[model samples]
Target: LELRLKSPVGAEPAVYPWPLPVYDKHHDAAHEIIETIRWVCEEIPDLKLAMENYDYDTKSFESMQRLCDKYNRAIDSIHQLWKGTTQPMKLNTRPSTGLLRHILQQVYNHSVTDPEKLNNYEPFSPEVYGETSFDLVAQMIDEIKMTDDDLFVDLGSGVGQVVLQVAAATNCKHHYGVEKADIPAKYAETMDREFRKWMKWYGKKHAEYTLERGDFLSEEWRERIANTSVIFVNNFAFGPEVDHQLKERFANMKEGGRIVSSKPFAPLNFRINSRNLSDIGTIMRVVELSPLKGSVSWTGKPVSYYLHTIDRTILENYFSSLKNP
Candidate 1:
């Protein structure tokens, strides 16, 4: 059998966890089913490309997911659908814009003051969602010289479009997305599973991912943020309370960690002191986070992620150069 000979259980993953669907079709219905499946392949291919190029203008990534699952499972998750496994075709991109958009649209839709559900649902403040185009995320990874060992963190990530974008482009070891908003944070969680399926189905692999649905300031997440190698803080017009909280958070960093922020950190504007450290020294050196065609800001201007290396001396090691400097 093709399932046994050419495909092994888990050695190199020639097949999936289960057996693929049988090729057998029913009497008088074989031709119809076969043709329908073929049409699916054609439709999804075109759809995938379009979704890959999709921007904020589009609505309903949920529809995208439905169409995507229909074709991909037939191609990738067929074993489940067909009651076994089928070797799926290798695709470069994961067809998950539907999942991507689904969560995002929910975030966008829920951001309103609301004709209804206002009390139960908390809308995203300032709705600070500016998607970094696929082009820009790819370029950011390169310009920053991200390596395979790095972990990418998006603090306050809304709907996690950039997280998906970065993982698709880079070989970074792991990825994490944190969104405080209950509405969108939950949406990102749903997309994460779909994205995983997309990765396995497409024969592509990247860093493992974790989606956190809570305030980054919460103690549960503070350490995770502190330990990350590269962090994306897309806080566009944060007030002093948030900025103060942010500076304290920044003080917790492990040296050589990088931070990319939308607006300038207070240290860049003026030095601020904290009981935690001897100084909130001038550690932020300027790095470019230039804009791209699809990379737009909340204000409709071009986007740029102000890149800086965390130069704080909080974590002291006698051998470490950053110690008490």
Candidate 2:
């Protein structure tokens, strides 16, 4: 026997456009089923957490029971509304032909690349230490007298480990990481989210940090360069594209701004002869260019490099004023 319920007869055309007498029972049943599913799914997560953290001896258990009762009442109200207004459709069902066999196969294949072994998809982890160590980074921060308001930019920011560590330690206004790899960029974002969550839990906030994805040589990125107080470049050998980007940053900065490239591109023998030249009348200072050296296992090779540079103009002005004094 098929049961049917309908909205009040002779109601306004806008309110009862369809003849509901034909299928009210089925429609109401379908509505009730959907509402019940929705209510259960919504409250399950909270219930799970409460169960996991339940303490039998404390008043926490009483609080959890109260919360569950509140949720149940809410669901009951929704279900009653569904029972009063809707109907369910009925059909003679038959199943024999598997027309969707091919589609289901494709969907299954896409979901599981290979069933033989489990896939290990981990976040990217790139090593940043070349010749410079954490001590050297801390020393440079001290030497530059970097303040909390200073904006720090790390070019070719690989995996952003250095940038993250620096921001945590220095409390800089903002730390920007420019990386090209998608995996590394995502890794940096994950790290930033985790750090922020930890801070919120502890009632402490860390310095603002950002990761930008793009080839550093692009003109778009060059235009977006902020008037950074400090630019840090570690001495890892870069290809032509990255080298061009480095030069562009040098040309884009304002006078008196400082650049600290741990490994400067200069001959080891001529390290003492390195000179800071202003683009003639610029406020840039080439202050304190010091060379450093180290060895690597990949090349079984020895490497030498420089640590830092202030604006050339600042360096020249400081020395010139001293001479006049």
Candidate 3:
């Protein structure tokens, strides 16, 4: 009776919860929840004020933490709302892509004030985290033209955003995402959980996704490369040392493998970058990256795109007879 006759029941939302369906029904569900609370309180009166046992300066640093759980509803909202907004799709995609960015920015903002968010790496190369703008993600999907038969791998898959978009855009059979940072890998897992929950309403199948927390180099994911038709790496912020390390490792990919990178594999021709080019020297050459008018990096800033492959070769002199191996 206390709830029915009490302090303004359902007068207003306790907070502006997203995925309003869940939150909205809670107010209605309170009829049953209150009964449980009251019954359970008979065993302990203190249960009424359970979360308020402590006191602090009231300046919550915790609010800065990335809002992964809270942002799902926002992502869905944009998935439904962005294109409809007055914002044109060509120059201004923010009407659709803006919240997607803010979802990533939550962690960036928190890291500004939190110390542990810094240096989230192990003994080797230090790394930074950011999402490639959603608009650009769409472009990569279009350019790659991945089919259900292909497998995709994302190097340094932070928060699994790229893999998430890649799966949605292509529905490729399998995807591998490696992240060196511990916290973000866990976040990636949460994002994966939420991805399924959100995408279930739409029908898709066998979209195998995996996330590994470690250096993609030492991970010994050789088999992953052999079968993979496409690989994506964002090396704009990577030093030459790291890029060189990647180039050497990328050599392991089977013939016909393709790579998309933010920087050239080697300063020389695509064939030269494949210098000592992994399995077959002169194996890889630039397939695209010409007429580079538009591209962007993880930080949502302008950058170049390098699409290379080890599958094809050039016959400089047609007159010269060629022999099969």
Candidate 4:
């Protein structure tokens, strides 16, 4: 539906499509082009005054080509400005969140030819599939931080979107997505393919990632879960039994490891007492995070996420106080 040209500014490429797509709730490439054009114009006043009265037919290929040409020239001007400066201004190597979303939306549109197949989950069950929108995922990426030495795992990752987005944004050593559902796992394979291809097409880089069909509760994942530094799970719809099992898994995580979940696994006001010594809260601290605006779920209402860190100091201090008193 569009074409991409390498940008002279060495940022994300310039995208132009005939009969420009303008109405997608997710960003359209046409708007990306205009956004860049306007941003460049804001810095360079000459281009601003020149294009103020320019007109082009939206549906005409020739007119769109003309618009694209102008954008390239504008980028060239910006590129020269950076080059002529004496100070070494580092060119950005990572795509901004806006550019990332635009690329991901395009990849999803191309790979997910049949969106209805994701609706094959059981009716009124905990396994019902829902997506964390790009906006919400971007906010979550900001909420947590990762380094190149860390490993990240996403439990019940649907279509690997969250993991992919994280991999793109951070420099984690590896990112893993485990989805037990058959239908979404089937699509995840295609998602993985399309994500890699499109990332390369846009000349962007992402950390190593894997999307696999496996139960996060199984024997193999026990070791995997223990070694992971950061874990993400959308456990809002989970029943108590599954949450209990997940608590056991979290118990095995190394100290200072983090877990981000839609629902808190431990109470926010957890206090270590002899009576509650066996509770997960004794070993971990959980805090309810403020929900970002529009960070909603399939039900279309804002949802909060909880951050949990494995810190057994609460339990240790409790036991130490018991001995002293």
TM-score of each: 0.55, 0.46, 0.56, 0.78
Candidate 2 structure quality by residue, lDDT tens digits, 206-241: 467886777655766675553776777763656444
The 10-residue segment of model 4 with minimum total lDDT is: 85-94
Best by TM-score: 4
Ranking by lDDT: 4, 1, 3, 2
- What is the TM-score of candidate 4? 0.78
Q: Which segments of candidate 4 are over 4 A away from where they belong?
A: 1-58, 61-92, 294-301
Local distance difference test scores for all models = 0.54, 0.46, 0.52, 0.77
Q: Model 2: what TM-score?
A: 0.46
| Ten contiguous residues with the weakest lDDT in model 1 | 1-10
- Against the true structure, candidate 3 reaches a TM-score of 0.56
Q: What's model 1's lDDT at 75?
A: 46
Model 1 per-residue lDDT tens digits across residues 203-288: 44455677778778888767877778888877775556686677777777777778877776634443333442444444545465
User: Model 3 Cα displacement at 220 (Å)?
Assistant: 2.4
Q: Give the winner by lDDT.
A: 4
Put down candidate 4 lDDT per residue, 152-189, tens digits, no spaces.
99999988889989999999999999999888898889
TM-score (C-alpha, index-matched) for candidate 1: 0.55
- Comparing 1 with 4 on lDDT, the higher-scoring candidate is 4
